[PDB]
Amino acid sequence: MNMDWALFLTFLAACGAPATTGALLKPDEWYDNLNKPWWNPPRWVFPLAWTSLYFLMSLAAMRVAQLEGSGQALAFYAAQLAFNTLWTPVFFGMKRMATALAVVMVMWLFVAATMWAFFQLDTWAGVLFVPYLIWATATTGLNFEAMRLNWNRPEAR
């Protein structure tokens, strides 16, 4: 088991895809006007938490990918990253809060699944995913509350 830099930089580069979704956001008065739970962090917290988790999940996948029988784990990981990349555009871009809520739940389930598979192969890779899963749970709660506490128009069918 090593710090393998070809693996870790490949997974890190991969997190460049969700990274662009967040960067390409402007200040948005639609989001500024939303009612929000008291525990909603300020917007500057999110790039730093997401950045940290990009490093933690890339370090976790890096370990797992040096181990035998890791295919199912890395299938869960590919699915996790892909629905994570899809959420931000759906919520902030298209402003479809219901559809984004379905998305972040499919994400949460694949994050939990990865973490679990990771735990069957490597406790540290599993442990590295725990703050991801927590952050994903809060993200689900935030999307859910944005929809509970606000007016939603109908989405394009």
Added chain:
Amino acid sequence: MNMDWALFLTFLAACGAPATTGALLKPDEWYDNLNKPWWNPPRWVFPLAWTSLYFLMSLAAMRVAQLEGSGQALAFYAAQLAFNTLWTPVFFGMKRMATALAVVMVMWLFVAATMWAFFQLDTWAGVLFVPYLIWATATTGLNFEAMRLNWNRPEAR
């Protein structure tokens, strides 16, 4: 080497994240009005091309993920899939064409890298990414020609 239905259905399900980008953002009226290159294919072509490629890439990844030392190849697979998911919301959603070109070029590099890495472990998995790399090369040209042939629109530059 087998038909692993859990592996395959996981990779296919991960393809649900990109498949969702098209469903929510079908080619726009704004997209119709862009000047297109002469070889631009009709509009029914793209849903059947992407749908085939999700089955083909999921099948390829399923073979590879059963093999030993497939970590790096699976790492490339997560990388291409994420940049794939990111591309449609950048080009069709935000209409930021120049950023989209960067995105689809990075995607192309990671599709080439997955293919190459698939060939090192399983010849069939490599063969099945061949039409993907071909199609990603066509996607890249379309994105380039969309900017080239619509350079007077601010969203192209």
